[PDB]
């Protein structure tokens, strides 16, 4: 993967949490052209899709569809140490899809399932780690309730969530299965 | 019975006068012209829709047929109207003034009309009253047939009327009779146009799917002919032409056993694999369509105000050509002596494509560059 | 009586540019599976990415037919809840909350 920029477009990001689908974030309502995806995790038990427009690097929605109760780890409290970096929606260098013009979905989905995923959930916040790697760099802040973190090796590694009240982690745990 | 005819000729040779006289005289001698609206307002190759053609229209009625007559005010309008399929025609009416012979513009127009495949042309000599000799009329009537035969029209068999529209609409007999003979030639010499349902079957592929336990299904709208269940069909396109059988036809509301042209249907095939079928291909009757890569065609480049280039292109031009359902990048060959092709003028060109595509003579296409329609064309002659 | 739409009960309007609803109760061989909007999101993505074709209705019907013939084959091998499926050219995940006596489908991918 490759992430290369941030923007500053002020627009409301809606975040719903169903009892079926664990998490879902919709920063923009994309209808000009559907997005293309990067799917991470273990393909059978832990799948997390990330959508990004084809016209540019803007994201549409990143949501995990299924997560294992064993691949998560609840802890007492956060390590909330947060150096605030530039705010706004990030972008992605779309070279991964060299031929997105063949109009076949096969060449449209690049998904490295060799990287697993862990989720650190608490009654206060929830963070997501990918790749089983000890890499940390700047933390982009999409909204005050939703932050994101890139690694040193040109990739997004850590995800974070704020202002979450356990009334919806009830549905989150009803959906994790 | 509804038949579409067109007028070809110089503007000041009196073609509008002819149209007015035809309408008024046939309204007098026969019943009034019906107000029926039987035809669409546009053309095949849907990406070329919205070129803002002028398309001057009239309508009249004979005891046997109802004629919709179309003419274009200028050269650019006429060439856009012929290259695109707007206001389709089953016959054309060549208008030449007997006072001054055919013009180079008329010669180019009938050449274009042959290239686009206008099936029949009858000639009307106007202003034959302003000449006091029958022999000069004989010589000009011979030279127009000679020109028509030069451009592959049956010049020997072409009906020719020596009349005068002005004196005809001035109520004088012996000229009303001449334009009535013109209408009779419209009735007799022009055959009934070939119905689309009777043409060979052809279906552009738009989307392809696979259903477990059922097979591969293609979803497109059928352009010509009829397809029934159990018949063998040949898929022709980028890959080598393959054979399959239609094991059913599915429609959005009910499953039917026959697919008529104009309907959006779903065709289940036999034995074919999803990987072998693509979008740019077409289903057809076996042996009725062939794939080609090189073809001579006549094209019109959009002007700056019509949404085309602001600058000309040259011999090294390599655009995409949008056929029924896909674009294919192609390289062009210009006529000798043509260094540049400005925006807004029509020209002949020999296009060779990077992948084969099922094509026959008369197939229209769009010319795009980056997803924006920049020109329109029609294949004139398929090559190797 | 239709061919495929007789097994679908629509619950939301159609996805922009298609004829498939955002969510529906699919009745396959008597089993009632409610489709989460994510499956329909991905199906509409498939049908729109090829470009607007203006004949999207029959394509949507064929897509729903393929989805039904895949979910019946998923029932053929038994439903693995919250796990990716092995049906050829597809992949589906299911779930079942206590309030829902009918299973729910959360994922549809057509490679």
CSV table of N, CA and C in Angstrom, one decimal, chain A residues 20-21 33-37 39 43-45 47 49 54 65-66 103 105 108-109 174-175, chain C residues 34 36 38 42 45-46 48-50 82-84 91 93 97 100 104 106-107 109-111:
chain,number,residue,atom,x,y,z
A,20,UNK,N,-25.4,-6.4,13.3
A,20,UNK,CA,-24.9,-7.4,12.3
A,20,UNK,C,-23.5,-7.0,11.9
A,21,UNK,N,-23.3,-5.9,11.3
A,21,UNK,CA,-22.0,-5.4,10.8
A,21,UNK,C,-21.3,-4.7,12.0
A,33,UNK,N,-18.4,7.7,-9.1
A,33,UNK,CA,-17.8,6.5,-9.5
A,33,UNK,C,-17.5,5.6,-8.3
A,34,UNK,N,-18.0,4.4,-8.4
A,34,UNK,CA,-17.8,3.5,-7.2
A,34,UNK,C,-16.3,3.4,-6.8
A,35,UNK,N,-16.0,3.0,-5.6
A,35,UNK,CA,-14.6,3.0,-5.2
A,35,UNK,C,-13.9,1.6,-5.5
A,36,UNK,N,-12.6,1.5,-5.3
A,36,UNK,CA,-11.9,0.3,-5.4
A,36,UNK,C,-11.3,0.0,-4.0
A,37,UNK,N,-11.0,-1.3,-3.7
A,37,UNK,CA,-10.8,-1.7,-2.3
A,37,UNK,C,-9.5,-2.4,-2.1
A,39,UNK,N,-8.3,-5.1,0.8
A,39,UNK,CA,-8.8,-6.0,1.8
A,39,UNK,C,-7.7,-6.6,2.7
A,43,UNK,N,-8.3,-13.9,5.4
A,43,UNK,CA,-9.5,-14.0,4.5
A,43,UNK,C,-10.6,-14.8,5.0
A,44,UNK,N,-10.4,-15.7,5.9
A,44,UNK,CA,-11.5,-16.6,6.3
A,44,UNK,C,-12.2,-16.1,7.6
A,45,UNK,N,-11.5,-15.5,8.5
A,45,UNK,CA,-12.1,-15.1,9.8
A,45,UNK,C,-12.0,-13.7,10.2
A,47,UNK,N,-11.7,-10.1,8.2
A,47,UNK,CA,-11.7,-9.3,7.0
A,47,UNK,C,-12.0,-7.8,7.2
A,49,UNK,N,-12.1,-4.3,4.9
A,49,UNK,CA,-12.1,-3.7,3.6
A,49,UNK,C,-11.9,-2.2,3.8
A,54,UNK,N,-11.5,6.0,-7.4
A,54,UNK,CA,-10.5,5.8,-8.5
A,54,UNK,C,-10.0,7.1,-9.1
A,65,UNK,N,-15.7,-6.5,8.2
A,65,UNK,CA,-16.9,-7.2,8.1
A,65,UNK,C,-17.0,-8.3,9.2
A,66,UNK,N,-15.9,-8.9,9.6
A,66,UNK,CA,-15.9,-10.0,10.6
A,66,UNK,C,-14.6,-10.0,11.3
A,103,UNK,N,-12.0,-3.2,-16.6
A,103,UNK,CA,-13.4,-3.3,-16.2
A,103,UNK,C,-13.8,-4.8,-15.8
A,105,UNK,N,-13.6,-7.1,-12.3
A,105,UNK,CA,-13.4,-6.9,-10.9
A,105,UNK,C,-12.2,-7.6,-10.3
A,108,UNK,N,-9.3,-5.6,-9.9
A,108,UNK,CA,-9.7,-4.4,-9.1
A,108,UNK,C,-9.5,-4.6,-7.6
A,109,UNK,N,-9.3,-5.8,-7.2
A,109,UNK,CA,-9.2,-6.1,-5.7
A,109,UNK,C,-7.8,-6.6,-5.4
A,174,UNK,N,-22.3,-7.8,20.1
A,174,UNK,CA,-23.4,-8.6,19.5
A,174,UNK,C,-23.0,-9.0,18.1
A,175,UNK,N,-22.2,-8.2,17.4
A,175,UNK,CA,-21.9,-8.4,16.0
A,175,UNK,C,-20.5,-9.1,15.8
C,34,UNK,N,-32.2,-12.5,5.3
C,34,UNK,CA,-32.3,-11.1,5.1
C,34,UNK,C,-30.9,-10.6,4.7
C,36,UNK,N,-28.0,-8.0,4.3
C,36,UNK,CA,-27.5,-6.7,4.8
C,36,UNK,C,-27.1,-5.8,3.7
C,38,UNK,N,-24.6,-4.3,2.9
C,38,UNK,CA,-23.2,-4.4,2.4
C,38,UNK,C,-23.1,-5.3,1.1
C,42,UNK,N,-21.9,-4.0,-2.7
C,42,UNK,CA,-20.9,-4.6,-3.6
C,42,UNK,C,-21.6,-5.0,-4.9
C,45,UNK,N,-22.0,-2.0,-6.9
C,45,UNK,CA,-20.6,-1.6,-7.4
C,45,UNK,C,-20.2,-2.4,-8.6
C,46,UNK,N,-20.5,-3.7,-8.6
C,46,UNK,CA,-20.2,-4.5,-9.8
C,46,UNK,C,-21.0,-4.0,-11.0
C,48,UNK,N,-22.4,-1.2,-11.7
C,48,UNK,CA,-22.1,0.2,-12.1
C,48,UNK,C,-20.7,0.4,-12.6
C,49,UNK,N,-19.7,-0.4,-12.1
C,49,UNK,CA,-18.3,-0.2,-12.5
C,49,UNK,C,-18.1,-0.4,-14.0
C,50,UNK,N,-18.8,-1.3,-14.6
C,50,UNK,CA,-18.6,-1.6,-16.0
C,50,UNK,C,-19.0,-0.3,-16.9
C,82,UNK,N,-20.2,-16.3,10.4
C,82,UNK,CA,-19.1,-15.4,10.6
C,82,UNK,C,-17.8,-15.9,10.0
C,83,UNK,N,-17.9,-16.8,8.9
C,83,UNK,CA,-16.7,-17.3,8.2
C,83,UNK,C,-17.0,-17.2,6.7
C,84,UNK,N,-15.9,-16.9,6.0
C,84,UNK,CA,-15.9,-16.8,4.5
C,84,UNK,C,-16.3,-18.1,3.9
C,91,UNK,N,-18.2,-15.4,-2.3
C,91,UNK,CA,-17.8,-15.5,-0.9
C,91,UNK,C,-18.8,-14.8,-0.1
C,93,UNK,N,-20.7,-14.4,4.1
C,93,UNK,CA,-20.6,-14.6,5.5
C,93,UNK,C,-22.0,-14.3,6.1
C,97,UNK,N,-28.5,-12.9,15.1
C,97,UNK,CA,-28.8,-12.4,16.5
C,97,UNK,C,-30.0,-13.0,17.1
C,100,UNK,N,-33.4,-12.0,15.7
C,100,UNK,CA,-33.7,-12.4,14.3
C,100,UNK,C,-33.8,-13.9,14.2
C,104,UNK,N,-28.9,-13.7,8.7
C,104,UNK,CA,-28.6,-12.5,7.9
C,104,UNK,C,-27.3,-12.8,7.1
C,106,UNK,N,-24.2,-10.9,5.4
C,106,UNK,CA,-23.5,-9.6,5.5
C,106,UNK,C,-22.5,-9.3,4.4
C,107,UNK,N,-22.2,-10.2,3.5
C,107,UNK,CA,-21.1,-10.1,2.6
C,107,UNK,C,-21.4,-10.8,1.3
C,109,UNK,N,-19.5,-11.0,-2.6
C,109,UNK,CA,-18.4,-10.6,-3.5
C,109,UNK,C,-18.5,-11.5,-4.8
C,110,UNK,N,-18.5,-10.9,-5.9
C,110,UNK,CA,-18.5,-11.6,-7.2
C,110,UNK,C,-17.2,-11.2,-7.9
C,111,UNK,N,-16.2,-12.1,-7.8
C,111,UNK,CA,-14.9,-11.9,-8.4
C,111,UNK,C,-15.0,-11.8,-9.9
